[PDB]
RNA sequence: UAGUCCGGAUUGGAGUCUGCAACUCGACUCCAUGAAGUCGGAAUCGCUAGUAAUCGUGGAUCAGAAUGCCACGGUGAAUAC
RNA sequence: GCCGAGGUGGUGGAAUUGGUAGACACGCUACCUUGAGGUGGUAGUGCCCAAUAGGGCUUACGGGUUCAAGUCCCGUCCUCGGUACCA
RNA sequence: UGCCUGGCGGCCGUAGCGCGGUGGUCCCACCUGACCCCAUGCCGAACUCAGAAGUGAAACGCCGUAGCGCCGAUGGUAGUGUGGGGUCUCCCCAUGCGAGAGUAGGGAACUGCCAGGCAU
RNA sequence: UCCUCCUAAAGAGUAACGGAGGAGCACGAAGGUUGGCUAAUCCUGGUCGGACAUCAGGAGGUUAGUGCAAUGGCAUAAGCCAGCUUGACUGCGAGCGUGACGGCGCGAGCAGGUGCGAAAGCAGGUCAUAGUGAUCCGGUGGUUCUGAAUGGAAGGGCCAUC
RNA sequence: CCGACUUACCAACCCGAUGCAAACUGCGAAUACCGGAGAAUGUUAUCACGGGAGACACACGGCGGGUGCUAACGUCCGUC
């Protein structure tokens, strides 16, 4: 149910984002990890992905499921996407409320050089 | 039917007004309604009038 | 909880008149002195005592020899 | 407070020893306790519902939510969106302390008490009892009293059967005639 | 007591499969959404579907409810 | 007389009677009275045939009617001109296609069944036949 | 100053006495209960002084069974243009 | 046949602005007055559940609408008033 | 290269339910508490934060079952365009198209992009 | 006169004193945006409380709901709730649809100035389809546009509106 | 007050099997319609603009219907 009620809040914004054709920055939040993916204009293939389940990100932070890990994941996905070059990305909160951790991920993506 | 015709008149640079309808027995309250004025080209406060 | 709208809810010491003392978070505004307790109640101990429900031949014999 | 730690030792250990639970998560947990006051006579004046709300606020620790009517009924002269009942849903530690005051203090005071009959489970371990007059809780002054103004408390347990929830509530020494 | 009927309001599919449209052309007039908007197709305030780009019209069934969608291929 | 309790609309169109019937198998009972020709039966004729049949068998066995009218038929009064609306609903008919089992009976011998179906078929306007149920 | 420490009907229990016998259907006593009733509609009655009003006592009938009937006293008015 | 109006206690009847009806005048019942009737005066007076507080059933019938129908809508029965003409 | 697990899809019931069994090193879920972010028309239920003692109960995934749901032939039937015929308010013929329902049967999906752990 | 369904023969349209129902409005929120949520009806349990009010759980899955008739729609909700608001904004408008015409409708985008949102974005009224009358004549406000010798003014024009 | 005993009383919802519908539809043609490509044929048969019109009482026959009585050389539509 808790998983099921969230996909509605996803399904609204995902539909119009795929209608526009914008590159979707998808975030995912669990109680102990956090994930980010930069998915193509078609919405099938990803470009990059960064999370706390990556080893090299987890080697440098204390807890894998709080705000600082989210900020490190955001700056990692921003620096990797800027090494690729994805300049205009549109963020999607994926059914999660904005303020808690995906605010930290979104902001650390923004001030690492990603314009949204 | 029961909606009276009223107009709403500009505050700054009144060479303009809009016109709307309002029910007197439910709402005796005023409109202020910050609409656009084409004369002064800004969004001004408008006021209820006959 | 929503901060100021709730009534005060403080730790008091209730004084059970069966002999007992209990710290209880409550709302009464004093140290409440209750009469009977969960201890020493007739239903809780077993002193509920429903009467015989038919003692007629008992009553006739305690009357008459 | 008290009944939580008494649960966390004795109730889980006894429902472990007499019910086959390979995991401790299968043991039923009393999850929430709601006090409902279906006032209902506030179709004439809502001073009465306003008094009943403060009565529930004195009984529990939470400010009660007023419940408006769901569908319009002309059998009882009610309107859609008329506030006709009052409720508290209390969960967690405040529910544990309300459970303390309900068992240790309140249920001796039901004034010719004969034991709450256990057949009031609805099918999935949730209990419901009806307290007929409000003065059985000692938070009421009784110098102030206006009406009788009872309530009903329904306990939601995570039990799936009636016998599991019955053994759960009996492990906290419910009267159970 | 009978005898009243409104004027028929000319609804229906105006442009069918494979037809070349310009942008802004009306494809379907309808009351509800019998057809839903897809790529390069906009939905009006009375649920009119119109060409938001110039191409060819395409009808599909999509989604988990087997619903009709109208797409436009930019030719 | 059989007519629908609480029908949706009071009057309906004339329509046509093309096609072959759907209820061709005798399902409920053993013997059946089946329709050979097209037409329509009013509820008066259905009840006349039913009374004649159950009087012919002396109230033994079981009788099923398999057609129900559900179609209102109007008339205009005499010395009333054409126009001014649809006429008032007078009576209800059931439309009958070739091959429709109109009646069934079970719990009787075959010759009493055949003779009762003859005495009941005398009241009906359409041409009929005697049929028997068949396995598969 | 309350349906109240007013009211004492009703009913549950335990008794006592008379009497062949207290169920139909007695009187009383105890314990408990604590109903209507908050001065009474249209109407209507008695009384002129030791009277009305009020308080108690006694007798006949009678095994038991008076709030009735017949008697006795205590206190004791108002009003008669 | 066509149009308009009506049907509500035992009666005459007011409620025809959806917000749980019979209000008023008769009649009836009870009491008083009277030698006794009538008049007169006080109190009841739509039907069934309990001795009550109250609830069920009730507007010609049947059905729909809504939360709710005497009330608006439809159909049917009965009764009024008007028309049913030109050849 | 093979298993799992998660995210985004493709597709939209041959893909959904029921019934049975199975998983916790990871991943995930339940979980723990609420100085603080934030939240409740009451309530840390949810939303949110700070976390890791337990459990795989529930959920989720996987596997097995046809009891349903679903798909679905070949024939035949209905209907019908065109041109003729009648006993013509209904059909027949020549010819072209040809269902729906039902039947034999199929069937508890398949797969792409990436990420993590495992044995290789 | 207008709207919805059928007649209407699977594009559109299509008559009758053919079969059925509605409209002559409402709403500064019932419009905009952001965030969130998901019914009807039954069963069980529980103070008064009882077929039917409030509570709790289960079944069921949209049989509900839509400001108002019917149809088409709606879960990403167009349904329900709360925060902030005035886009119920001005000038246009590629292109279409529908009418004999008068007319009626849909519209991406552009300029100016805003509202909500962190942002992508969305908003130039409402789930859509009824809620409506041409012209003349005059009323009011603004704009030197004209203004009968000249300067004004009257009166016309234009724009908003009755 | 419980509540027992019954019955040629009726019985919703569900199950199993029949039908019916212009205003029912989880299915669904043939034709017709819209568009594109090609060949042959056709006295441009097509569209636009201008000059001049007439006509706007239709009739029957077939097919699909409404109404009427699946009456009418009836009436009202669609199409030839």
What does this entry look like structurally?
This is part of a larger assembly, with chains A (116 residues), B (50 residues), C (65 residues), D (177 residues), E (75 residues) and F (136 residues). Chain B is mostly beta strands and 50 residues long. Chain B has a single domain (1-50), classed as Single Sheet (Rubrerythrin, domain 2). Chain B contains no helices and 3 strands. Chain B has strands at 4-10, 17-22, 46-49. Chain B is elongated. Chain D is of the alpha+beta class and 177 residues long. Chain D has one domain (1-177): 2-Layer Sandwich (50s Ribosomal Protein L5, Chain: A), CATH 3.30.1440.10. A 5-stranded antiparallel sheet of chain D has the order 2-3-1-5-4. Chain D is built from 4 helices and 5 strands; from the N terminus they run H-E-H-E-E-H-E-E-H. With 136 residues, chain F is an alpha+beta fold. Chain F has a single domain, classed as Alpha-Beta Complex (Aldehyde Oxidoreductase, domain 3), CATH 3.90.1170.10. Chain F has 2 helices and 7 strands; from the N terminus they run ββαββββαβ. Chain D binds 5 RNA strands through strand 1, strand 2, strand 3, strand 4 and strand 5. Chain F: Belongs to the universal ribosomal protein uL16 family. Chain F: Keywords: Hydroxylation, Methylation, Ribonucleoprotein, Ribosomal protein, RNA-binding, rRNA-binding, tRNA-binding. Chain F: Pfam families: Ribosomal_L16 (PF00252). Chain F: This is Large ribosomal subunit protein uL16.
């Amino acid at each position: 149910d808790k998983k099921s009620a969230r996909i509605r809040r996803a399904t609204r914004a995902r539909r119009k984002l795929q209608e526009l054709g914008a590159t979707r920055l998808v975030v995912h939040r669990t109680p102990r990890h956090i994930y980010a993916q930069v998915i193509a204009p078609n919405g099938s293939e990803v470009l990059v992905a960064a999370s706390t389940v990556e080893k090299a990100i987890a080697e440098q932070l204390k807890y894998t499921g709080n705000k600082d890990a989210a900020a490190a994941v955001g700056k990692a996905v921003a620096e990797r996407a800027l090494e690729k070059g994805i300049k205009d990305v549109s963020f999607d909160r994926s059914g999660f409320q904005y303020h808690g951790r995906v605010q930290a991920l979104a902001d650390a993506a923004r001030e690492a050089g990603l314009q949204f | 039917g029961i909606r009276e015709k009223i107009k709403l008149v500009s505050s700054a640079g009144t060479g303009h007004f809009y016109t709307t309808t309002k029910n007197k027995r439910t709402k005796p309250e005023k409109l202020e309604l910050k609409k656009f004025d084409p004369v002064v080209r800004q969004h001004v406060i408008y006021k209820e009038a006959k | 909880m929503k901060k100021d709208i709730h009534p005060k809810y403080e730790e008091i010491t209730a004084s059970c008149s069966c002999g007992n003392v209990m710290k209880i978070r409550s709302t009464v505004g004093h140290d409440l002195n209750l009469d009977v307790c969960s201890k020493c109640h007739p239903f809780f101990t077993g002193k509920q005592r429903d009467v015989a429900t038919g003692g007629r031949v008992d009553r006739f014999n305690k009357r008459f020899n | 407070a008290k009944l939580h730690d008494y649960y966390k030792d004795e109730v889980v250990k006894k429902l472990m020893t007499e019910f086959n639970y390979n995991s401790v998560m299968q043991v039923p947990r009393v999850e929430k306790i709601t006090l409902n006051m279906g006032v209902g006579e506030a179709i004439a004046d809502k001073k009465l519902l306003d008094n009943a709300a403060a009565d529930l606020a004195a009984i529990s620790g939470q400010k009660p939510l007023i419940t408006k009517a769901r569908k319009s009924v002309a059998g009882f002269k009610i309107r859609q969106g008329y506030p006709i009942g009052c409720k508290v849903t209390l969960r967690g530690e405040r529910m544990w302390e309300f459970f303390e005051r309900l068992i240790t203090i309140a249920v001796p005071r039901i004034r010719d008490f004969r034991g709450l009959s256990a057949k009031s489970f609805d099918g999935r371990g949730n209990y419901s009892m009806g307290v007929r007059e409000q003065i059985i809780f000692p938070e009421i002054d009784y110098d102030k009293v206006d009406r009788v103004r009872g309530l009903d408390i329904t306990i939601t347990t995570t039990a799936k059967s009636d016998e599991e929830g019955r053994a759960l509530l009996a492990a906290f020494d419910f009267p159970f005639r | 007591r009978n005898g009243r009927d409104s004027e028929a309001k000319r609804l229906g599919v105006k442009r069918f499969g494979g037809e070349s449209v310009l942008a802004g052309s009306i494809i379907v007039r309808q009351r509800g959404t019998k057809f839903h908007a897809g790529a390069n197709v906009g939905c009006g305030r009375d649920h009119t579907l119109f060409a938001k780009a110039d191409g060819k019209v395409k009808f599909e069934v999509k989604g988990p409810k087997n619903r009709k969608f109208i797409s436009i291929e930019a030719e | 007389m059989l007519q629908p309790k609480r029908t949706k609309f009071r009057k309906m169109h004339k329509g046509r009677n093309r096609g072959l019937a759907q209820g061709t198998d005798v399902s409920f009972g053993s013997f059946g009275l089946k329709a050979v020709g097209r037409g329509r039966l009013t509820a008066r004729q259905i009840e006349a045939a039913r009374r004649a049949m159950t009087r012919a068998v002396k109230r033994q066995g079981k009788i099923w009617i398999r057609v129900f009218p559900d179609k209102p038929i109007t008339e205009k009064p005499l010395a009333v001109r054409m126009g001014k609306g649809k006429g008032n609903v007078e009576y209800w008919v059931a439309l009958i296609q070739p091959g429709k089992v109109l009646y069934e009976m079970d719990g009787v011998p075959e010759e009493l069944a055949r003779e009762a179906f003859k005495l009941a078929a005398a009241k009906l306007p359409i041409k009929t036949t005697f049929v028997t149920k068949t396995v598969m």
